[PDB]
Amino acid sequence: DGPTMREITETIAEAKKKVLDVTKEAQANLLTAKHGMTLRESFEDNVVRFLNEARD
Amino acid sequence: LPHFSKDDYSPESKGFVENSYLRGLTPQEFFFHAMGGREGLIDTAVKTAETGYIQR
Amino acid sequence: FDMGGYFIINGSEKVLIAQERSAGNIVQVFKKAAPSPISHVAEIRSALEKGSRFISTLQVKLYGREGSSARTIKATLPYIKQDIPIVIIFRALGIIPDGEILEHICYDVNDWQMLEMLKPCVEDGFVIQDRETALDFIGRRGTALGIKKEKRIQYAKDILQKEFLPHITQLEGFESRKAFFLGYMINRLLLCALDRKDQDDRDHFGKKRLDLAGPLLAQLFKTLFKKLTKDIFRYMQRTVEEAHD
Amino acid sequence: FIKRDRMRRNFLRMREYNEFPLRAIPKEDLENMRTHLLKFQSKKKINPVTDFHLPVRLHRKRKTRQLKVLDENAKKLRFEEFYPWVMEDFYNTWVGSYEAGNSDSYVLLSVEDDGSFTMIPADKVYKFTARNKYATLTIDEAEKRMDK
Amino acid sequence: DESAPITAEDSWAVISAFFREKGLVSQQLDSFNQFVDYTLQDIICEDSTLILEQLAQISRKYEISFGKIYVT
Amino acid sequence: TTFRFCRDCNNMLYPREDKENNRLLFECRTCSYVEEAGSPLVYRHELITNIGETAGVVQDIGSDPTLPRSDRECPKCHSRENVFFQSQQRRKDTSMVLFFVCLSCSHIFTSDQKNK
Amino acid sequence: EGLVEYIDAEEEESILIAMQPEDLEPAEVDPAKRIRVSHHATTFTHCEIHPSMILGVAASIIPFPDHNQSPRNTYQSAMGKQAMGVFLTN
Amino acid sequence: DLDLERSNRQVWLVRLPMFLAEKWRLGKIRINKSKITLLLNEPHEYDLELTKKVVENEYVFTEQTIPKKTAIVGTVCHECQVMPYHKIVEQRRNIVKLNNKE
Amino acid sequence: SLMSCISVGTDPMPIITFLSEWGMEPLEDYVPHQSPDATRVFVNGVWHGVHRNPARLMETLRTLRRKGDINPEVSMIRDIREKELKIFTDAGRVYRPL
Amino acid sequence: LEPGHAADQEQAKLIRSAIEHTTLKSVTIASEIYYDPDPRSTVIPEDEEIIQLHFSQQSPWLLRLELDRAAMNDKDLTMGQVGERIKQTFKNDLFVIWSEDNDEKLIIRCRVVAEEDHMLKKIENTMLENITLRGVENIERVVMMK
Numbered sequence A: 001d002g003p004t005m006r007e008i009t010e011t012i013a014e015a016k017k018k019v020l021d022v023t024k025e026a027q028a029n030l031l032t033a034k035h036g037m038t039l040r041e042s043f044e045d046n047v048v049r050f051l052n053e054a055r056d
Numbered sequence B: 001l002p003h004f005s006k007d008d009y010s011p012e013s014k015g016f017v018e019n020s021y022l023r024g025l026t027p028q029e030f031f032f033h034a035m036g037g038r039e040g041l042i043d044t045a046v047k048t049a050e051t052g053y054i055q056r
Numbered sequence C: 001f002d003m004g005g006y007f008i009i010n011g012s013e014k015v016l017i018a019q020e021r022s023a024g025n026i027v028q029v030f031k032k033a034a035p036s037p038i039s040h041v042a043e044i045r046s047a048l049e050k051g052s053r054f055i056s057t058l059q060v061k062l063y064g065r066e067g068s069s070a071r072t073i074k075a076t077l078p079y080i081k082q083d084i085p086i087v088i089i090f091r092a093l094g095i096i097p098d099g100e101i102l103e104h105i106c107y108d109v110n111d112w113q114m115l116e117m118l119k120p121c122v123e124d125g126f127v128i129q130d131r132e133t134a135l136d137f138i139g140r141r142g143t144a145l146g147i148k149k150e151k152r153i154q155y156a157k158d159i160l161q162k163e164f165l166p167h168i169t170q171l172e173g174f175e176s177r178k179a180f181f182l183g184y185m186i187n188r189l190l191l192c193a194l195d196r197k198d199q200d201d202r203d204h205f206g207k208k209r210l211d212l213a214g215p216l217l218a219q220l221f222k223t224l225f226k227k228l229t230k231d232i233f234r235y236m237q238r239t240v241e242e243a244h245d
Numbered sequence D: 001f002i003k004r005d006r007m008r009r010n011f012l013r014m015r016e017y018n019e020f021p022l023r024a025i026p027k028e029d030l031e032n033m034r035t036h037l038l039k040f041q042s043k044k045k046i047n048p049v050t051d052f053h054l055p056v057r058l059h060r061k062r063k064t065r066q067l068k069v070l071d072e073n074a075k076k077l078r079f080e081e082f083y084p085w086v087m088e089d090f091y092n093t094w095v096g097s098y099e100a101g102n103s104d105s106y107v108l109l110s111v112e113d114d115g116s117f118t119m120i121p122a123d124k125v126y127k128f129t130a131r132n133k134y135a136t137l138t139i140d141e142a143e144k145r146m147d148k
Numbered sequence E: 001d002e003s004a005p006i007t008a009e010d011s012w013a014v015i016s017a018f019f020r021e022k023g024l025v026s027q028q029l030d031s032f033n034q035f036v037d038y039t040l041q042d043i044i045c046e047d048s049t050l051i052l053e054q055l056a057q058i059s060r061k062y063e064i065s066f067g068k069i070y071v072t
Numbered sequence F: 001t002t003f004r005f006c007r008d009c010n011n012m013l014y015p016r017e018d019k020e021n022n023r024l025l026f027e028c029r030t031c032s033y034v035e036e037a038g039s040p041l042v043y044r045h046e047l048i049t050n051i052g053e054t055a056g057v058v059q060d061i062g063s064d065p066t067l068p069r070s071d072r073e074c075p076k077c078h079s080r081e082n083v084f085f086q087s088q089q090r091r092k093d094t095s096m097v098l099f100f101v102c103l104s105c106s107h108i109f110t111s112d113q114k115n116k
Numbered sequence G: 001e002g003l004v005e006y007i008d009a010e011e012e013e014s015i016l017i018a019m020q021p022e023d024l025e026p027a028e029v030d031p032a033k034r035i036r037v038s039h040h041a042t043t044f045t046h047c048e049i050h051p052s053m054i055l056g057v058a059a060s061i062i063p064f065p066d067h068n069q070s071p072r073n074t075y076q077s078a079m080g081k082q083a084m085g086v087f088l089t090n
Numbered sequence H: 001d002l003d004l005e006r007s008n009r010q011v012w013l014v015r016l017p018m019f020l021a022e023k024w025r026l027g028k029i030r031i032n033k034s035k036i037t038l039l040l041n042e043p044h045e046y047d048l049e050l051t052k053k054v055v056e057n058e059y060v061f062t063e064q065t066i067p068k069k070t071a072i073v074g075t076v077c078h079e080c081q082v083m084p085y086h087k088i089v090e091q092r093r094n095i096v097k098l099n100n101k102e
Numbered sequence I: 001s002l003m004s005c006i007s008v009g010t011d012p013m014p015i016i017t018f019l020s021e022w023g024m025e026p027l028e029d030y031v032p033h034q035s036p037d038a039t040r041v042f043v044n045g046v047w048h049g050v051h052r053n054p055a056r057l058m059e060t061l062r063t064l065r066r067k068g069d070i071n072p073e074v075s076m077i078r079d080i081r082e083k084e085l086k087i088f089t090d091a092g093r094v095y096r097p098l
Numbered sequence J: 001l002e003p004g005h006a007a008d009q010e011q012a013k014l015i016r017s018a019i020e021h022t023t024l025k026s027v028t029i030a031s032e033i034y035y036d037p038d039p040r041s042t043v044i045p046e047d048e049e050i051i052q053l054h055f056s057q058q059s060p061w062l063l064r065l066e067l068d069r070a071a072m073n074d075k076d077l078t079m080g081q082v083g084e085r086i087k088q089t090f091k092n093d094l095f096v097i098w099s100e101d102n103d104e105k106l107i108i109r110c111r112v113v114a115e116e117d118h119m120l121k122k123i124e125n126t127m128l129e130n131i132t133l134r135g136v137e138n139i140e141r142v143v144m145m146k
């Protein structure tokens, strides 16, 4: 239905805003990675986690 | 792909397929989906080729 | 609607499938994750554009793992057994001073890292300081069929003028050019060792060359033509030797 | 949403100065002498031949019926002259080598006493190298000293 | 007008003008034709000369060389 | 580290300890050319390398179409037309700090808000 | 006349290609159409003739392959080399 | 018996274009005081650039173990290069890219 | 792919001859201390020399490449960061029209 | 871990600090060699403070190095215990000095009883690679998990 399509569009849009925010915080060097991984690994885990969360 | 800018970490350019199979897919998404399909076929082929030797 | 594009042999429609191979005359660098003393390899498959089909390939090896000191550079040469350092080859190419060698390898005086890693090669290049002693060194190292030294120094020089880098050209006097190209390959090897450039990708489709009927029939007709000439000359020598018509 | 296959009907229904002259030296002097070039490789800026002192000397240092391969002309004439020259006194040493690539187009504009110039085509070009500055060597002594 | 931007469908026409010129299997025809045109003369001319060296006791020689090749 | 070469010999100047006057010197072992020392430093390893991140910066970097475009102003000339790119030093632990390159004064100002 | 140019995989490293002409070149929605990218990039040096040309001969027979998964396009591309038909008239 | 004649003679080395060089295989140079040209005979005038101002360690000799007669000419004074109705020369340069084989 | 073709190879001699007419300095005359910002020119992997003006030269080779003088099968790349300009006219490359 | 010391983060930090391999190269930002003939007096104007404190026949050549304070934190270390480790490594042949934790610049200097530079450079390799500050061998990246 229409409203469901709009809820999916907003669900993906919120995840896109999250990936953009984590992207800006990563480009500004304001996010410290956890123990065991580097900045790029934690960033990719956050982006992939947000995208899979929005898809689910 | 040579259709995006350099040093782009946006999720859309990194492989996220926000479209669905009902409305079709874009070329830059169909290419990555083809990569995933070929990877699936190769992985299944290797898993079978080793599964036979393990079975023997 | 017959598209054509195939051959007919013995009533059978034969098709020559397009073959795929790698390109040549391009400097490549790779890493070695094995416990081998070589850390990076600078391979370059040199061959002419037309004729002979050369297979000789030059290799510039970097010894010593990361962390350990005394990381010298030694490049192999065709027909020469053991590997020869790059600076000694520079002495054999006519360049005796070392400041000119560092001027050909590294093109930036402000950078101290590459010049710093050049030091051991400048030490072994201090051990052998003469061009004549370098030509006699490569003459005594590889190819022992010369026996005489006076013919092995000129023979080694002819190796450096002909077999060394078949591309560009094979004439005498092009040692300065090949010195600049060699310093360029060393600059790419050490520049890849400083983690400033990634390992050269071989899966790039632009670095791959396809072969249709043209190249295949060029190799085939080339070898068959060589055999034809050799056989014709064999008949000539038989004719003049056996004294007949 | 359908393939438009009626395009045939649509297309069918739609359609202060100083001037000084130049001269060419007669070819007799060109037949007498061949002009070569000099380039030094010692980094020192000056190095004239007057400071090279005297006496300056530049001198060049049974089978049956079988098969031969072949070879051409100019390459053979350049291959037979494999003896490089040297300039010394009686001490400084300069040994030159061929340049080959720097042949191409090189015209000499020799300046005489008058403002005019004399143009001479360059035959070859050589790179002279100052040899034996330090004065040392060894051969087998270096081959055994490099084995440590 | 004549200086107006093209559309997406119009591009198909271009593709037509491509396949009318090349064809679906033009690479084999162009490569083979270039082989027959230039590669034959290049292979024949790159190593045609062979000489026999004859000795007598006065020296003697013989030579055979291949020129322009002919195809039927 | 930033060593000199000999005169005429052009060989590298190995360090020589002067025990008479007790001072550093620079020698050439091929010849007898020994010059004084203007610094006691000889060798610097520098393990953690941070240089090379801004490598390959040319005068014609503003005419690259593959490079992106941003609207952030320069702290010097205040020009919002610039081209940004990350570090050129390729390594695993290399941060993703952007490098802003103004298209007017050719200044390289980064976007790091923690350390500048 | 300088209106179309060949590009290999080496020159492709130094060019910026656009997909649709009348969708990415000019500067600025029904929910049934697919979502596309933006036109923030200005330095477009080249443009794709048509994306459907990236497929081979066997995949070209597929109707609406975008709405179908890739391994089915591969299986159909494999079954298209053995179906019954008329190869020639002679 | 090698003898240096003078070496005091000053010679200028010139890198000419191929058609005029092969033609030389006479004009009048006009020295404009830091820009100098050349008025050939009817025909073009040519600006010659001061390629290398300081040009030491370079000389010129002639020739009349096997010692031969060696004579010294003069020192090299300036490194130069001739620079270039230019549309006809540009068309000839475009025209040289049309060589074919039978 | 439906519009992909294979190159056939041309002749690099007219290009090398055409480069030296616009001031392409030969390789043997190169000094990195007198011309550090010179762009290296590569023809089929062979380093023939450098040039101190790759902008106007590249524009000239591109304009003459689009007019039909140079064979369109020749692919020329200008790597800025690497400071190189590769020229590929060898047979075997796969290209596509755009 | 033990049932008695369960659900404790500090104890697990002590165990991790007791088994995780650490080396001197881990903490090292850079090193540099100096010619300083007089054993006691130092030409370097900064280190004079150290000279004033850590003092109150030997090699004229100086080996010096600087450590990352962040490395001294993430991997808990003391300039003292480090100097202890080196002193009990090479024993008495190599004299040792190290800067204080209070110093905003962490400094370590060492000397010995042909050229001295080559000897120092050998000792540099031994220092970076062959010294393990703490932890048992072949243990890395200990991860806390609940």
Ligand SMILES: [Zn+2]
Binding pocket: F006, F007, F008, F009, F010, F011, F028, F029, F030, F031, F032, F033
């Ligand atoms: Zn010296």
Ligand SMILES: [Zn+2]
Binding pocket: F074, F075, F076, F077, F078, F079, F102, F103, F104, F105, F106, F107
């Ligand atoms: Zn600015």
